[PDB]
Amino acid sequence: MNIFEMLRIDEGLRLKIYKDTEGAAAAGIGHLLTKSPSLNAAKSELDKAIGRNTNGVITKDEAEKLFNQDVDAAVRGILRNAKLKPVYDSLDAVRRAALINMVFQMGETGVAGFTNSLRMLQQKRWDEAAVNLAKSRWYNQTPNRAKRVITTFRTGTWDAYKNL
């Protein structure tokens, strides 16, 4: 199990533009295209991202290419962030993947906002961090995914993804 397999499980794979959990236009493996409600705006962003006229459909190879770029961008996003880098550096390899998962899902700005949880993660207060991470719109909007991520932060193992 690794970060690509983990996010692949949480994001799924769609070879056509689709609305994500929160209405935004997305495609492939959780690749956010636009918050805009325009199907034309989303299509335009997809063509731009892929470099060709997709007409809203992409191949598996293209979904994966976008996926590699997005994971890479999530990591570098974490490493350039003053609030996130310290937390990331203090974590073991499995928990680092959990932090990357969150950033991939809600952006470094959103995650950097989980101030108290980050502090708790830094101090390695796993169970307190888990409780605090659950008191969020994030958890309430996407409970099944949030608990797999929270469980990963709490235990330091891949158990929450093992049964999947």
Protein described:
Pfam families: Phage_lysozyme. This is Endolysin. This protein is mainly alpha-helical and 164 residues long. It has one domain (1-164): Orthogonal Bundle (Lysozyme). The protein is 65% helix and 9% strand. It contains ten helices and three strands. The chain has a three-stranded antiparallel β-sheet. Helix 3 crosses helix 5 (93-112), helix 5 (93-112) packs across helix 9 and helix 6 packs antiparallel against helix 7 (126-134). The radius of gyration is 16 Å and the shape is elongated.
The helicity comes to 55-70%
SSE class: mainly alpha
CATH architectural arrangement? Orthogonal Bundle
Q: What is the overall number of helices? A: 10
Work out the radius of gyration: 16 Å
Strand-helix topology:
Elements: H1 3-11, E1 14-19, E2 25-28, E3 31-34, H2 39-50, H3 60-79, H4 85-90, H5 93-112, H6 115-122, H7 126-134, H8 137-141, H9 143-155, H10 159-162
Antiparallel strand pairs: 1-2, 2-3
Helix pairs in contact: 3-5, 5-9, 6-7, 7-9
Protein name: Endolysin
InterPro entries: Endolysin_T4_type, Glyco_hydro_24, Lysozyme-like_dom_sf, Lysozyme_dom_sf, Phage_lysozyme-like, T4-type_lysozyme
Pfam family, one: Phage_lysozyme
Keywords for this entry:
164 residues, mainly alpha, 3 strands, elongated
In short:
By secondary structure, the chain is mainly α. The chain contains ten helices and three strands; from the N terminus they run αβββααααααααα.
